[PDB]
Write an enzyme that holds these catalytic residues in place. Structure first.
Site, PDB file in Angstrom:
ATOM      1  CG  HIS A 354      40.328  45.272  36.568  1.00  0.00           C
ATOM      2  ND1 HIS A 354      40.475  46.630  36.590  1.00  0.00           N
ATOM      3  CD2 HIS A 354      38.922  45.164  36.310  1.00  0.00           C
ATOM      4  CE1 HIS A 354      39.304  47.100  36.004  1.00  0.00           C
ATOM      5  NE2 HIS A 354      38.266  46.441  35.901  1.00  0.00           N
ATOM      6  CG  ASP A 377      35.557  48.163  35.587  1.00  0.00           C
ATOM      7  OD1 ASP A 377      36.352  48.975  36.219  1.00  0.00           O
ATOM      8  OD2 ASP A 377      36.267  47.258  34.898  1.00  0.00           O
TER       9      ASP A 377
END
Ligand SMILES: [Ca+2]
Ligand SMILES: [Ca+2]
Lengths: 701, 707
Positions: A354, A377
Site C-alpha cells: 500500500h 494517505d
C-alpha cells in the site's frame, strides 16, 4: 443582505477584482522581470524547468525586477511601491493584498524591495518575499502615492508572478536541509513505484511531470476546486491536508474516481496510467473526476501536486498493509477446531502492498521534534471524521506512539503496527485465541533512493525494532491515545515457502515442520491458496489440499507440492496475486500452527527502443514492443507511452494481439528537455493488464 | 469484483441482512422452538422507567447501554439446562460481524458481568424462562434486531425477523462505566431528560431569552437521529463512540449543498424558506428533513445549536447550548481582531471588515476523553456553525473545554478556533495616507466577555465564562495564552493617561434613547480631544449595513477629572432601517491632540421587540382539551404583511403555524387551537411571529398539565 460576513470568502486564486488605477508624479512606462529561464531569477529560484513563461519565484528569497518611469525617481519627492494581489477579495490583513515597501536593507522574513540600481529613468529592485507567503499566482502592480490619491499600473497579465514553496529557503517550513534530497524530492519529475510483494518486489516508472506545461496551473485549480481559503495556501500542512482530500473524488468533486473492480467499464484501468500528467490535465480539461485510480495512482498524482508547488514529497510503499484498520491493532484470522481457516468469518485482509505519500515540513503546531516527513494517505479509510484521506501524520510521532497529535496518526500507526490474531471459533459459538503474529504487517516500508531507480528501505523510520523497549514504549503510548487492542493476549514449528513464477508457469511450494520436542506428534496441516486482488481481498480458493503429518522427536520434516499453472490460469486477477494459508492443528495438545505468504506471478514487459538522433529539438524514433507470451488472443490491447520532457502521454490500441505475436508502434518524438530522460509504457488489454516497460534515453543539448 | 474490501461498509442502521432461521452444515428434530418473546417494554413498566426511556413516544423497547433489562422467552417445551444451548442475539446493519460489534451473541450466564454482554436466566416457569440481559457500556448506539437461536451440534436454528422485538440501545448517562456518565441526577435530568431549553441572545448589557423545543421524545425524533447518521454514512461501529457521534452529527447539521439538515442563511429576506427566527424548536425541522430528505431552509447559529442539542439528548449524550457574547467567529486561530482608524481618529469602514458577533451559540456535549491526557473530559465544545478550520469551512469540535481554558490547543478537535472565539483582542490600527500602519491600542476585554447557559433550576442564566477562561490579569491566563501560542494560536502583530468608556441606554423599538460618553484625565496635563461617534445598523453577527448617526465633538480635559458628553438618538434616526434582531453598533474614538494618543471603544444595543401573548383555558389534563390562545399586537406604525405565527410546546402540541396576510397598525390578531396534551407536569407553550418585515418576535406560557 450579506449578513454572514462583510467580505465573501477569498478562496479562488483564479478569480480577480479590478484594482482602480486612481484612488508629473511618476508614472510607469515599462516593467522588467528578468524571467527568462536562463536568467538569474528562475535559475537561482530553481524554477527554470517549468514549461511556463511567467516569472516563478520561491518565497523567502529575493528576485530582481526593473521599473522604468516617465522621468527619473528622486528619493526627495517620490513614493511608490510594488504590490502583489491574489483573489477576488484581497485584504492586507489576510495576506492577499501585498504592498512591498521600499527598504534600505532587506529584513530576514518580511516583504521588501530594496533599490539596488538607479540609471536614468530605471530603478532596479531586489524584492524579498516573506517566507510564510501564500503560494499561488499573484497579480503585480506598481502604485505611486501622490497628494490626492494613489496612481497604479493597469492590469498587466504579462507580469503575473507565481510564488512557490521554497525547500532552499532556510526560513521556510518546507526547508529541506540538503541539496541532493532537494533534487530528488522537489526537482526530479520521474518516479518509481514499488509493487508486488515483500519477497518479490516489483518496480514500475511514473511520470510525475510537474514541470510539464499546464500542471502548475492545474495544481492551483485543484485548490480553487476545494475552495481553499487563499489565506491558508501558504501553510504546507493545510495544503497537504486539503490537497490530499481532493485526490479521491468524493462523488463528482475530486480528481480521481477510485475502483478495484477488475473491469473498469466506463474509464481507464488504474494499471493503464503512466503518469499524473494526462490525469491532471483531463481533470482540469473536464472539470470532473477522472476514472479510475487506486493507491499508487492517487499517490502518483499527489506527489505531482506537492512537488509542483514546492513541498518536498516522495511515495512510500508499505508491505502487508493494514488499511481500514479503524485504529485497531489486531487483524483476525478465524480457525475451526479442525485447524482449518474459517472463510466465512475471516473477512479482514492485509494489503500485499500500500502506497501513500510523504511530505516534508516542520510541525510548529506540535511539540518540537516532529517535523521532517509527514505521512499523508490519499486512499481513504475510516478515521475520526468519516471515510477520508489520513494525514498529515508526523512519521516521527508515529514512530514514537505520540498518536494524539494531528492528523489521523492512530490509523497510520495501525497501518504499519498491527498484529495477526489466530482465533478458533468453536462449534459452540465461543472464540479462543490461538496465536498472535507481531511481525507480518509493515514488514518492509520502501521508497525510491536519491541517486537512482533503486529501492531504499525506510521501515525503521516508522517504527523501532521488534522486542526492544523503544518499540514497546511507542506501543504503550499509542494504546493511550487512540490505538486499540480489543482482545487480550507445543515445540513444533511450521513454515512454508511458495515459489515466484512467471505468468503461465507451474510452481513449487514447501512446508517445513520441526519438532524440537521429545514426544511423537500427529498433525493435520491444511493448505488453502486463494486468488486475491493486491489488497488481499480473496476472489477464489483455486487450490485446497490437506496434509497429514506425523512428527517424530528432534525431527525436521519438509513436504512439497506443485501448483500447476492450470489450477490458477483462468482465474487470476490483474497484478496476478495469490495468497497461501497453511494451518495445522496438532492432536495431542490441540494447539495451532499457522502461516501465510503471498506471491504474485511475475508479469510480462513492453520493449522500448530508440534510434534516430537524441537531441533537444530533434526527432528520434521510439518503438513500443509487446510480445504476448500467452495462449489467448488479447482484445483491445491499449498501449501507452509517456516520458517526461520527451513526449506527452499517448495511447494506441491494437484490435487483438494473437498468441506469441509481437506488435509494434513507433512514435517520432522531439525532446524539449536535455539530459537524463526516460521513455515509459504500459499495456492494458481487455483481460491482461498491469504490464509495464521503460527505456532510458539520453537527450543532448 | 470489489477488490477494495471483502465486505461492504456497514454504515446504515436501516439496512438489514436476512439471518437464516436454520444454518446447518455437515450431515445427519425438536430441540427447542421459541413460541414467543416478551420484552417488558410498556412505558409504565420497569424496563423503560429504570432505563429512563419512558418519555419516548415510541412503542418499541428502548434501553440504555451498560444496564440490565428483562425479557421472557416462552419455549415450545421447558428449558432443560441439561441439554439445551440457546442465546439471544442483537444485529445491526446489512453486514454484521462479531468483530465490529454489529452481531452480538448474548451468552446465557451464571452471573451478570461488569461491562460485558450477557443474559442471566433469572426465572423458569412452564416453558417460559426469564432473562436479565446486560449490554456492554461501550455498545454501538442504534436500533437493533433481536433473534433467539438454538444451537444444535450441526449449525443453529433461530427466530425469524420480528419488527416488534427491535430494541433501541442508547448512551447511558446513568451508568458509571459509560463514557457519557454524569454524576448526579439534577444534571442528568437537565442535560438529558429536559426537552425544553432557553436560548440566550441580545447583547452582554441586555441579555435576551426565548424558549426552544428540543422535543427529543416526540414521535419520530429518535428514528430521525438514526436517519441523520445514516445519511452521513456513519460506520455503525463508530456510533458507540460519543466523540465520533458528536464529530459526525454536528458536521451534518449545516447543509453543504444538498447534504445536511439546515441551509444556513443570514440575508434578512429568506425568499424560499422559513426565516431562522421563525422556528420554535427542532421538531418540525428534523421531521421535514426526514420527509423531504433534503435540507431545511433556513438556520442561523442558535438554530443549528437547537437541532444539535436535540440530536445529542435524544441519543443519550448530555448536552447544553452556550451563548458567547461578543464572539470572534471566522478567526483562523488569530487572536487579533482589527479595527482600522484614519489619521484624524475616525474609524475607517472600508478597511474594517472583520466584525465581532453580538453573541454566538454553540453546544456542549459531556463525555470522557480517553484519547487525550487525563483531565480533559467533561463538557466538550462543538460548534456546528462553520468557520475555516484546519480542514476547510466546517464545524469545530468537540474540543475539551478544559483544554481551551489551559490553552492546550494541540489536542483535537479544532481547539485553536474555539480558543480564539473567546480570547481574541481588538486591535485599533491607524491606516495612514502614505499606506503604512500604526498600532494604537489593544482592547483585551471585549471578546468572550460573557459566556452563558440555562440553569439546572429553571429559565435563569448560568455564567460559565470561568469554565472557558481564567480571571483576566492573573498568571493562569497568561500561561494558557502562552501555551496556546505554541500549539496553533496566532497573534500576527506585536503589542497620555486619559481613559474613556461610554454607556448606551437600552430602548424599546420605536423609542428615543441616549448614549453617554465619559473621559477621565488621570494626569496633571490638560488635554484637548476630538471624539467621533459612528452608529451602525447591523446584523447580530456584527456585519454593518449603514451608518445611521455620526457625530464629532471637541473636548477640553482638565487635569485629573471626569467629563461627560450625552447624546440623544431619536427613534426617527434608525426606524426605517433595522435588520431582524434590531442591533445597533456604536464606535466612539477620539484623538488627544497633544500626544496623538488614541482612545477607542465599542458597544452594541438591541432594540427590545414586544412579546406575543399566549393564554390557555379549559382542562389542562392529559388526554383532555384546553384551548390555547395566542394573540399578537402589531407594535409598529407600519402595516405587516404575511405575518406568520407559530405555536409549540412539546407534549402539549405538535409545531404549527397560521398566516395573517396583513396586520394594520395597532391591530391585534388572535389564533386559538385546541390542544390535547399527552405529557403531564410542567409544560410550556411557545410562539413566534415572523412577517415580511418585523420578525424575531417570541412568546411563551408555562402550563401545569394534570393527570
Ligand atoms: Ca509489528
Ligand atoms: Ca481576553
Amino acid at each position: 443582505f450579506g449578513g454572514r460576513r462583510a467580505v465573501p470568502p477569498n478562496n479562488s486564486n483564479a478569480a480577480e477584482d479590478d484594482l482602480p488605477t486612481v484612488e508629473e508624479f511618476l508614472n510607469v512606462t515599462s516593467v522588467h522581470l528578468f524571467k527568462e529561464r536562463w536568467d538569474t531569477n528562475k535559475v537561482d529560484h530553481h524554477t527554470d524547468k517549468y514549461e511556463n513563461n511567467k516569472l516563478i519565484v520561491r518565497r523567502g528569497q529575493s528576485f530582481y525586477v526593473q521599473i522604468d518611469f516617465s522621468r527619473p525617481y528622486d528619493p526627495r519627492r517620490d513614493l511608490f511601491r510594488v504590490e502583489y494581489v491574489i483573489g477576488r477579495y484581497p485584504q492586507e490583513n489576510k495576506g492577499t493584498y501585498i504592498p512591498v515597501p521600499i527598504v534600505s536593507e532587506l529584513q530576514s522574513g518580511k516583504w521588501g524591495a530594496k533599490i539596488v540600481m538607479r540609471e536614468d529613468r530605471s530603478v532596479r529592485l531586489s524584492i524579498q518575499s516573506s517566507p510564510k507567503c501564500i503560494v499561488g499566482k499573484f497579480r503585480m502592480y506598481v502604485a505611486v502615492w501622490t497628494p490626492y490619491g494613489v496612481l497604479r499600473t493597469s492590469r498587466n497579465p504579462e507580469t503575473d508572478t507565481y510564488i512557490l514553496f521554497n525547500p532552499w529557503c532556510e526560513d521556510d517550513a518546507v526547508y529541506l536541509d540538503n541539496e541532493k534530497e532537494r533534487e530528488e524530492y522537489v526537482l526530479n519529475d520521474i518516479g518509481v513505484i514499488f509493487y508486488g510483494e515483500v519477497n518479490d518486489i516489483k518496480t514500475r516508472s511514473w511520470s510525475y511531470g510537474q514541470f510539464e506545461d499546464g500542471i502548475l496551473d492545474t495544481c492551483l485549480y485543484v485548490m480553487d476546486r476545494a475552495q481553499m481559503d487563499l489565506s491558508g495556501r501558504g501553510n504546507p500542512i493545510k495544503v497537504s491536508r486539503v490537497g490530499s482530500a481532493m485526490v479521491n473524488a468524493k462523488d463528482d468533486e475530486g480528481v480521481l474516481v477510485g475502483s478495484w473492480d477488475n473491469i473498469y467499464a466506463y474509464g481507464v484501468p488504474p494499471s493503464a496510467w503512466t503518469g499524473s500528467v494526462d490525469i491532471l490535465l483531463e481533470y482540469r480539461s473536464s472539470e470532473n473526476p477522472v476514472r479510475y485510480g487506486q493507491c499508487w495512482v492517487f499517490a502518483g498524482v499527489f506527489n505531482t501536486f506537492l512537488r509542483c508547488l514546492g513541498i518536498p514529497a516522495r511515495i512510500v510503499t508499505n508491505y502487508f498493509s493494514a488499511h481500514d484498520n479503524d485504529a485497531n491493532l489486531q487483524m483476525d484470522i478465524f480457525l475451526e477446531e479442525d485447524g482449518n481457516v474459517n472463510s466465512k468469518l475471516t473477512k479482514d485482509s492485509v494489503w500485499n502492498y500500500h502506497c501513500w505519500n510523504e511530505a516534508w515540513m516542520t510541525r510548529p503546531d506540535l511539540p518540537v521534534g516532529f517535523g521532517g516527513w509527514q505521512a499523508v494517505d490519499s486512499t481513504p479509510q475510516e478515521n475520526s471524521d468519516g471515510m477520508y484521506r489520513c494525514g498529515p501524520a508526523s512519521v516521527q510521532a508515529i514512530k514514537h506512539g505520540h498518536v494524539c497529535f494531528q492528523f489521523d496518526a492512530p490509523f497510520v500507526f495501525a497501518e504499519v503496527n498491527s498484529d495477526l490474531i489466530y482465533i478458533t471459533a468453536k462449534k459452540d459459538g465461543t472464540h479462543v485465541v490461538e496465536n498472535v503474529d507481531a511481525t507480518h504487517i509493515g514488514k518492509l516500508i520502501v521508497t525510491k533512493q536519491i541517486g537512482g531507480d533503486g529501492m531504499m528501505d525506510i521501515t525503521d523510520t516508522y517504527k523501532f525494532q521488534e522486542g526492544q523497549e523503544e518499540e514497546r514504549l511507542a506501543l504503550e503510548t499509542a494504546l493511550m491515545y487512540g490505538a486499540k487492542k480489543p482482545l487480550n493476549t507445543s515445540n513444533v514449528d511450521m513454515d512454508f515457502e511458495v515459489e515466484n513464477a512467471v505468468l503461465g508457469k507451474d510452481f513449487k511450494l514447501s512446508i517445513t515442520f520441526r519438532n524440537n520436542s521429545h514426544n511423537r506428534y500427529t498433525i493435520t496441516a491444511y493448505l488453502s491458496a486463494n486468488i486475491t486482488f493486491y489488497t488481499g481481498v480473496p476472489k477464489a480458493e483455486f487450490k485446497k489440499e490437506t496434509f497429514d503429518v506425523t512428527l517424530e522427536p528432534l525431527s525436521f520434516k519438509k513436504e512439497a507440492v506443485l501448483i500447476q499453472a492450470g489450477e490458477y490460469m483462468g482465474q487470476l486477477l490483474e497484478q496476478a496475486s495469490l495468497h497461501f494459508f497453511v494451518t495445522a492443528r496438532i492432536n495431542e495438545t490441540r494447539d495451532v500452527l499457522a502461516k501465510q505468504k503471498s506471491t504474485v506471478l511475475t508479469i510480462p514487459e513492453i520493449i522500448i527502443k530508440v534510434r534516430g538522433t537524441q537531441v533537444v529539438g530533434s526527432d528520434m524514433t521510439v518503438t513500443v514492443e509487446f510480445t504476448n507470451p500467452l495462449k489467448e488472443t488479447l482484445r483491445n490491447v491499449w498501449v501507452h507511452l509517456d516520458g517526461p520532457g520527451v513526449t506527452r502521454p499517448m495511447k494506441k490500441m491494437f484490435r487483438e494481439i494473437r498468441p506469441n505475436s509481437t506488435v509494434q508502434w513507433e512514435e517520432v518524438c522531439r525532446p524539449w528537455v536535455s539530459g537524463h530522460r526516460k521513455l515509459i509504457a504500459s499495456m492494458s488489454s481487455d483481460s491482461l493488464r498491469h504490464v509495464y516497460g521503460e527505456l532510458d534515453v539520453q537527450i543532448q543539448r
